């Protein structure tokens, strides 16, 4: 079910994990030591994941901070 | 658990279960629940007339604890069902 | 509402650990009710023994630093709490939330009594300061003297007698020691004016409070609406809903001898100023009057304009 | 008599909600257990357990969670002041919601169907003949249940308080005290926070700030909220503090009440040449903000003279009084004013910003600068005001610069009049 | 005579926030123009070295989690590189009048309480409590972790009546023990000052200044602030430090915790040491609660049995109860 | 003997360490590098900041502290590479590898649990590893 | 800057390379160099050795903490700190911290 | 539509151009070689343009530097 981590370096114990559900993938912002997640977002394929992710403003870990601030957004 | 079986429709002895046991939870959605946690990790779901007496250290009784939920009640409660995914 | 003969001034009272919540809807600098209730506490500890009478209080507010935090780049703020001791059982407790400030403020006062004929000025001001040094000003402690005891001598000024040149002279001698601070008044007539301006659609006043202290961006067929001053929402009294109760009725009162009602606060408009706009410094003190036939309480500075 | 078409139809609809999970061995008892209850006994067992809830509009619990006592629905009067505002201005839109054991809110929604475009709530406190035509039951049933239905909107039966209820004395005109127990204005808090969440985002807010992205705006006006402060109730369990939805997970935030010196600075007058050369300006962002606001009142003619007759007179007082605040901040902070270069043009401003006397000062200090009432810095300050804001000559051909020159005349006159006693 | 439903005691021994400023030893008597210790940021690249479970643990997430570096931003406070002495300054008022509550329902219960406390003071003075308070000002309990591993710690205490100094004390914190309350002439003098303060016989304002040799450019330890950690937005930054206007500082209630470590009268073990005075006398770091209510040594049990029923406990437990009244708090139901 | 007399609590030990290196005239020195994050702002910014104190380049304290505790010559995998520093789940961030796996029985948590709770004393060099982790310090437990 | 990264050659046309080296890779960095008339780096720091390396600062259990102190005291009484201080002395001897 | 340049000497390829829209004029700070503009500001008549411009602090090209730093101002 688990595929990979989205970033290669943890920014204060937090990282985005990429999961597989069948015909869709599940990106999920989560703590690493504990395991409990803070927000999630469902995509259809990994091409949508990389195509959406590489369009974010930033480079390196500013991109992963923007992605964690995007997936774990206050929904209301 | 047994207190809602010898008194399965007696809500006064469920108020005695409020008198003896420990702290309480509430669930607000389209429906409405109260949750009575016990010392034996037994959480009484209470809703109007109907109820459910949960038995922990058993994932099948936690499936029965998830047999009393709307999907909006399952929009909440996900940090409570996944909280109980340890007990082996 | 009685005009005082003297204006006693406390120079630099630095509160450690104040109460920066002050209401369920406003946030920052604390209520005027703490600063008036402090004066009535001085009236209950000093003024009956030196035969004087203390009625109002003048907020000057030289310095203010709230223990806040702003992480994660958001444009909102959170608090900086403290710990509590462990549980009744021995695990941990819940977390209530409490505001906090490192305040420094100067306070004008108002004296009515006959103690001036019985005692000189330095004696009166010395007794009042050396009682106020052991109290708690707005829910937090009052910092004692240090190397900065150099402004710590008080002042006292009779207002009625003397020529007008001594009135404006010594008045400007007062306002050169309140010089970096910003005074605070109440300006509800402006709120009635904005009710009469926005009275085309709806005369509601709470939504006027929501539509005064904010940055109104009005676009062009973008122009920021010009603010006519440094206005601020403050709590301004109580508007009691329950009928009054006899003393020995409600369980868990403070004492079983004074009556009770259940109240809610009442929101008003106030304004921070420089002290040189004020015509006479006796038109700055915070009084509070009442009529307990109904639930109508308020703090005010009557006759400011 | 369509109340039987409310009760007897709506309970049947809730039975249709229970048809999704029905087995025949449980339907053998659920036939009479649902139908015989659904006619008469659902209101009996439901009416027996209404007092587990409590419908109030001001709750004591967000003051402290352990506190038990008196919650109040009572908002009978709006007798308030001519200028003061509060939760008496609600009138309509009364969001008053449920405090208590949440297991039995099915009664509450059942009482919510009474005000579905009808005046049957007064027929739920009275009007038993309307319950004789419509409900058509016995007098003990409909009248006793009608006695038992007011008991969710009223108090439990005795006044109470707690030692964590913020009880405060309040002195009177020459009389005793009234100790008061304040509450938390929950309906007002929910209403105002619904307004703030409508204002910060929504349909037209995203549209108009999207027009700020596009520079293509239309008739509309929005606003921005500086310095909202989050206050959180309940802790990790905002459920036990009642009424708090996922929209309000202990999320009551506060409008600011800061005094305008909350953001202090470091006073920029060191012995370096940069501040010593440009010392005549004396600027902050507030000074230049008021100066540019003063410049923006130049394209205002007499056609809308309600604003310019008032705001221009007040608008120049804050600049010179703000300069008094600059000498205030310079005065009691940096007492070290020793010898350095540039003591000929910064010598009149030195006697304007009169420092403390030196410790090595001899007897020739009551004659070196004693007669220094420096009225020349009102002239340099006048030149700084003249070069700062534009002085139009089309207002000079009119009487706008005679009245305007009168305003700067008397305002700089009163500024120097403050400057008359800088030493004496 | 039931208990009062509302009780509240205002605190005495009110400290202030301690300020830290660094300098050089033997420039110690001129410690008045020393610059403050500032709080700064630095980044920290560490590895993940906590405990990791075995349930719901894909080993790809495990080995992917261990083998990757962690990034983080913290706050530190260090001395300047040419200074080896920490200076910690605070003040202390001693109010006095430690029997009168600030809020009480009953009038008979309050008069019985004042007769009990006045009976205690008339039987024996405040000499014991002021002796132990004098020992906690003598050494450097209020230097919590800054004391640990130091060459020499010197404490200077001043008494202030006006813009002057009445009497100055100069101690040595390492010679004075951490656990052994031994008498001394100067500690009896300062204990007479504090005991004269708590009885209401005068006004007592003290200025406390502490000096510690740590090392050139070493690390000082201010008190740490709360990042609330409410669900989302953990943030890049960690370990924020408390401060005043551009100076590191310690909270006032932590010094106030360090002053009231009196209690050597636990039922469990008197071999560990004095830990501070609390009702249900507990230690948050150890996770234990000494002085259980299932025993008869709790503050509420002794206060109820000594006010309402005139059953006077042992003398040292009376020192405990009066120590809780000098602490102050919110009592009653 | 001085450091061993210091860690046992028999005295106070403060050392001053000064290092000298011939590199060359005008060559490049290597201070430690700070954290920046390229987010979405205007006109760009820097890409390499360096740690400093008041107008002097410097190295972080935890990097020197990393350089002092390179003890561990007792890996199960290979003792031919060299001593790399002492960590629970003994890992190298640059190499991307984690020696001393918990699937073996040489982890710090496993040896500490088997040596405190059950009195199963490990080999002597692993005891040097465990006491080295106690001199390192950390946040242990659940 | 320049172009020296790997390419997938799934969106790497031969015109895309020339277009990508028309592109700016302009950049601003920090350097630290010696002065031109100096050839020696001096690195100074201090070091405290505290001691008491068995006592934790926070522990729930009292029996587990006493068992831990008996284990560590058993270790120190069986053999000293000579090995660890020997290896620490070797890391201060050479220049690992450079 | 185009009227004139506001300054008679380009200060590092940058100059203020004056345009006409009907009953209003449009001052626009722009590059000269490329043509793309950086900020703009709308006036009602040329008397407002010269009456506002000649009140700026400066003389010669300090006035045009202040005008370019005024029209191309950060609006927020």
Curated annotation (Swiss-Prot), chain B:
Disulfide bonds: none annotated. Keywords: CRISPR-cas system evasion by virus, Host-virus interaction, Inhibition of host adaptive immune response by virus, Viral immunoevasion. It comes from the Viruses. GO terms for biological process: symbiont-mediated suppression of host adaptive immune response; symbiont-mediated suppression of host CRISPR-cas system. Allows the phage to evade the CRISPR/Cas system type I-F. This is Anti-CRISPR protein 30. It comes from Pseudomonas phage D3112. The lineage of its organism: Viruses, Duplodnaviria, Heunggongvirae, Uroviricota, Caudoviricetes.
Swiss-Prot record, chain C:
Keywords: Antiviral defense. GO terms for biological process: defense response to virus. CDD domains: Csy2_I-F (cd09736). Disruption phenotype: Mutants lose phage DMS3 infection-dependent inhibition of biofilm formation while there is normal biofilm formation in the absence of phage infection. Loss of production of crRNA in the presence or absence of phage. Disruption of the entire Y.pestis-subtype CRISPR region disrupts crRNA production but does not alter phage resistance (possibly OLNs PA14_33350 to PA14_33310, and the flanking CRISPR loci), indicating this CRISPR is not involved in phage resistance. It comes from the Bacteria. The keyword tRNA-binding does not apply. CRISPR (clustered regularly interspaced short palindromic repeat) is an adaptive immune system that provides protection against mobile genetic elements (viruses, transposable elements and conjugative plasmids). CRISPR clusters contain sequences complementary to antecedent mobile elements and target invading nucleic acids. CRISPR clusters are transcribed and processed into CRISPR RNA (crRNA). Cas3 and Cascade participate in CRISPR interference, the third stage of CRISPR immunity (Potential). Absolutely required for crRNA production or stability. NCBIfam families: cas_Csy2 (TIGR02565). Belongs to the CRISPR-associated Csy2 family. This is CRISPR-associated protein Csy2. It comes from Pseudomonas aeruginosa (strain UCBPP-PA14). The gene is csy2.
Swiss-Prot record, chain D:
Keywords: Antiviral defense. Disruption phenotype: Mutants lose phage DMS3 infection-dependent inhibition of biofilm formation while there is normal biofilm formation in the absence of phage infection. Decreased production of crRNA in the presence or absence of phage. Disruption of the entire Y.pestis-subtype CRISPR region disrupts crRNA production but does not alter phage resistance (possibly OLNs PA14_33350 to PA14_33310, and the flanking CRISPR loci), indicating this CRISPR is not involved in phage resistance. The keyword Transcription regulation does not apply. Residues 66-87 are annotated as: Disordered. CDD domains: Csy1_I-F. InterPro entries: CRISPR-assoc_prot_Csy1. One of its GO terms (biological process) is defense response to virus. Interacts directly with Csy2; part of the Csy ribonucleoprotein complex with a probable stoichiometry of Csy1(1),Csy2(1),Csy3(6),Cas6/Csy4(1)-crRNA(1). A Csy3(6),Cas6/Csy4(1)-crRNA(1) subcomplex is also formed. In this bacteria, Y.pestis-subtype CRISPRs do not confer resistance to phage DMS3 or MP22, but instead are required for DMS3 infection-dependent inhibition of biofilm formation and possibly motility. Belongs to the CRISPR-associated Csy1 family. This is CRISPR-associated protein Csy1.
From Swiss-Prot, chain F:
GO terms for biological process: defense response to virus. Keywords: Antiviral defense. In this bacteria, Y.pestis-subtype CRISPRs do not confer resistance to phage DMS3 or MP22, but instead are required for DMS3 infection-dependent inhibition of biofilm formation and possibly motility. Disruption phenotype: Mutants lose phage DMS3 infection-dependent inhibition of biofilm formation while there is normal biofilm formation in the absence of phage infection. Decreased production of crRNA in the presence or absence of phage. Disruption of the entire Y.pestis-subtype CRISPR region disrupts crRNA production but does not alter phage resistance (possibly OLNs PA14_33350 to PA14_33310, and the flanking CRISPR loci), indicating this CRISPR is not involved in phage resistance. CRISPR (clustered regularly interspaced short palindromic repeat) is an adaptive immune system that provides protection against mobile genetic elements (viruses, transposable elements and conjugative plasmids). CRISPR clusters contain sequences complementary to antecedent mobile elements and target invading nucleic acids. CRISPR clusters are transcribed and processed into CRISPR RNA (crRNA). Cas3 and Cascade participate in CRISPR interference, the third stage of CRISPR immunity (Potential). Involved in crRNA production or stability.
């Amino acid at each position: 079910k688990f595929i990979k981590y989205l970033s290669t370096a943890h920014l204060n114990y937090m990282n985005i994990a990429v999961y597989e559900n069948g015909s869709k993938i599940k990106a999920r912002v989560e703590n690493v030591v504990n395991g409990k997640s803070v927000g999630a977002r469902d995509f259809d394929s990994t091409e949508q994941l990389e195509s959406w992710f590489y369009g974010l403003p930033g480079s390196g870990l500013g991109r992963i901070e923007n992605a964690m601030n995007e997936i774990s957004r206050r929904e209301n | 658990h047994h207190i809602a079986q010898q008194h399965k429709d007696t809500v006064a002895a469920c108020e005695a279960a409020e008198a003896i046991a420990i702290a309480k939870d509430q669930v607000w959605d389209g429906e409405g629940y109260t949750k009575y946690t016990f010392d034996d990790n037994s959480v009484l779901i209470q809703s109007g007339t109907t109820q459910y007496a949960m038995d922990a250290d058993d994932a099948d009784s936690i499936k029965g604890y998830a047999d009393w939920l709307d999907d909006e009640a399952r929009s909440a409660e996900a940090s409570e069902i996944e909280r109980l995914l340890e007990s082996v | 509402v009685t005009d005082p003969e003297a204006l006693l001034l406390l120079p630099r009272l630095s509160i450690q650990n104040a109460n920066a919540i002050s209401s369920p809807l406003t946030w920052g600098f604390p209520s005027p009710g703490a600063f008036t209730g402090f004066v009535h506490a001085l009236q209950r500890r000093v003024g009956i023994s030196l035969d004087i009478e203390l009625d109002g209080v003048g907020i000057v507010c030289h310095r203010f630093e709230a223990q806040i935090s702003q992480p994660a780049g958001k444009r909102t703020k959170v608090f900086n709490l403290t710990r509590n001791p462990l549980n009744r059982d021995g695990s941990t407790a819940a977390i209530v939330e409490e505001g906090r400030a490192h305040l420094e403020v100067s306070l004008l006062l108002g004296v009515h009594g006959d103690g001036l004929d019985d005692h000189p000025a330095q004696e009166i001001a010395r007794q009042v300061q050396e009682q106020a040094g052991a109290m708690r000003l707005a829910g937090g402690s009052i910092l004692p003297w240090c190397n900065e005891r150099f402004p710590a001598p008080n002042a006292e000024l009779l207002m009625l007698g003397g020529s007008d040149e001594q009135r404006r002279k010594n008045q400007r001698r007062l306002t050169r020691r309140l010089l970096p601070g910003f005074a605070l008044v109440s300006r509800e007539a402006l709120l009635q004016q904005h009710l009469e301006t926005l009275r085309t659609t709806l005369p509601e006043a709470t939504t006027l409070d929501a539509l005064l202290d904010l940055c109104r961006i009005n676009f062009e067929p973008w122009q920021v609406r010009d603010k006519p001053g440094w206005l601020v929402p403050i709590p301004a009294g109580y508007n009691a809903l329950s009928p009054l109760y006899l003393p020995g009725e409600v369980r868990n009162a403070r004492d079983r001898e004074t009556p009770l009602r259940f109240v809610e606060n009442l929101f008003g408009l106030g304004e921070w100023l420089s002290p040189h706009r004020v015509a006479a410094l006796s038109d700055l003190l915070w009084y509070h009057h009442a009529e307990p036939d109904k639930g109508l309480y308020r703090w005010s500075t009557p006759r400011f304009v | 008599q369509e109340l039987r078409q409310f009760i007897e139809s709506f309970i049947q609809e809730r039975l249709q909600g229970k048809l999704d999970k029905l087995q025949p061995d449980e339907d053998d008892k659920r036939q009479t257990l649902l139908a015989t209850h659904r006619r008469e006994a659902w209101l009996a067992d439901a009416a027996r357990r209404v007092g587990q809830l409590q419908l109030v509009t001001h709750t004591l619990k967000p003051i402290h969670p352990d506190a038990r006592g008196s919650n109040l629905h009572s908002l009978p009067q709006a007798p308030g002041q001519p200028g003061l505002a509060g939760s008496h201005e609600l009138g309509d839109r009364l969001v008053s919601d449920v405090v208590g054991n949440a297991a039995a809110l099915d009664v509450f929604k059942f009482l919510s169907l009474q005000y579905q475009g009808k005046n049957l709530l007064n027929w739920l406190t009275e009007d038993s003949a309307e319950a004789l035509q419509a409900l058509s039951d016995n007098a003990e049933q409909a009248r006793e249940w009608r006695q038992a239905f007011i008991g969710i909107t009223t108090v439990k039966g005795a006044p109470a308080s707690h030692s964590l209820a913020k009880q405060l004395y309040f002195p009177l005109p020459g009389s005793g005290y009234h100790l008061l127990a304040p509450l938390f204005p929950t309906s007002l808090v929910h209403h105002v926070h619904a307004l703030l969440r409508e204002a910060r985002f929504g349909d037209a807010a995203k549209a108009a700030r999207e027009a700020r992205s596009r520079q293509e705006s239309w008739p509309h006006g929005f606003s921005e909220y500086p310095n909202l402060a989050i206050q959180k109730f309940g802790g990790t369990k905002p459920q036990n503090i009642s009424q708090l939805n996922n929209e309000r997970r202990g999320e009551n935030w506060l409008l600011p009440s800061l005094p305008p010196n909350w953001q202090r600075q470091n006073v920029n007058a060191p012995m370096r040449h940069s501040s010593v050369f440009e010392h005549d300006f004396g600027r902050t962002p507030e000074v230049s903000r008021l100066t540019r606001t003063l410049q923006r009142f130049l394209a205002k003619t007499v056609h809308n003279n309600l604003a310019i007759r008032q705001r221009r007179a007040q608008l120049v007082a804050q600049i010179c009084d703000e300069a008094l605040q600059y000498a205030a901040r310079l005065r009691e902070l940096e007492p070290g004013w020793s010898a350095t270069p540039g003591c000929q043009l910064h010598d009149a401003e030195q006697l304007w910003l009169d420092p403390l006397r030196a410790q090595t000062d001899e007897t020739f200090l009551q004659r070196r600068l004693r007669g220094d009432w420096p009225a020349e810095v009102g002239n340099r300050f006048a030149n700084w005001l003249n070069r700062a804001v534009s002085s139009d000559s089309q207002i000079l051909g009119s009487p706008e610069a005679a009245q305007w020159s009168q305003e700067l005349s008397k305002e700089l006159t009163m500024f120097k009049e403050i400057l008359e006693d800088e030493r004496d | 005579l039931s208990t009062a439903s509302v009780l509240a005691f205002e605190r005495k021994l009110d400290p202030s926030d301690a300020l830290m400023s660094a300098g050089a030893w033997a420039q110690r008597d001129a410690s008045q123009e020393w610059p403050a210790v500032t709080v700064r940021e630095k980044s920290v690249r560490g590895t993940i070295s906590n405990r990791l479970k075995t349930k719901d643990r894909d080993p790809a997430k495990l080995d992917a989690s261990i083998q990757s570096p962690n990034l983080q931003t913290v706050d530190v406070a260090n001395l300047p590189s040419d200074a080896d002495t920490l200076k910690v300054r605070f003040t202390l008022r001693v109010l006095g009048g430690a029997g009168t509550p600030s809020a009480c329902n009953d009038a008979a219960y309050r008069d019985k309480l004042l007769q009990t406390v006045a009976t205690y003071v008339n039987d024996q003075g405040f000499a014991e409590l002021a002796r132990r308070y004098a020992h906690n000002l003598a050494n450097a309990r209020f230097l919590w972790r800054n004391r640990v591993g130091a060459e020499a710690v010197e404490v200077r205490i001043n008494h202030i009546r006006q813009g002057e100094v009445a009497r100055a004390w100069r101690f040595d914190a390492l010679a004075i023990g951490l656990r052994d309350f031994k008498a001394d002439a100067e500690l009896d003098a300062l204990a007479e000052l504090i005991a004269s303060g708590l009885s209401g016989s005068g006004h007592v304002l003290l200025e406390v200044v502490a000096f510690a040799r740590i090392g050139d450019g070493q690390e000082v330890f201010p008190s740490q602030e709360l990042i609330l950690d409410k669900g989302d937005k953990k943030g890049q930054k960690s370990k924020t430090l408390y401060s005043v206007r551009d100076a590191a500082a310690i909270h006032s209630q932590k010094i106030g915790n360090a002053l009231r470590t009196i209690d050597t009268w636990y039922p469990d073990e008197d071999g560990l040491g004095p830990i501070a005075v609390e009702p249900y006398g507990s230690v948050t770091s150890q996770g234990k609660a000494y002085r259980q209510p299932k025993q008869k040594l709790d503050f509420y049990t002794l206060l109820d049995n000594w006010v309402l029923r005139d059953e006077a406990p042992a003398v040292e437990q009376q020192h405990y109860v009066i120590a809780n009244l000098i602490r102050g708090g919110v009592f009653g139901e």
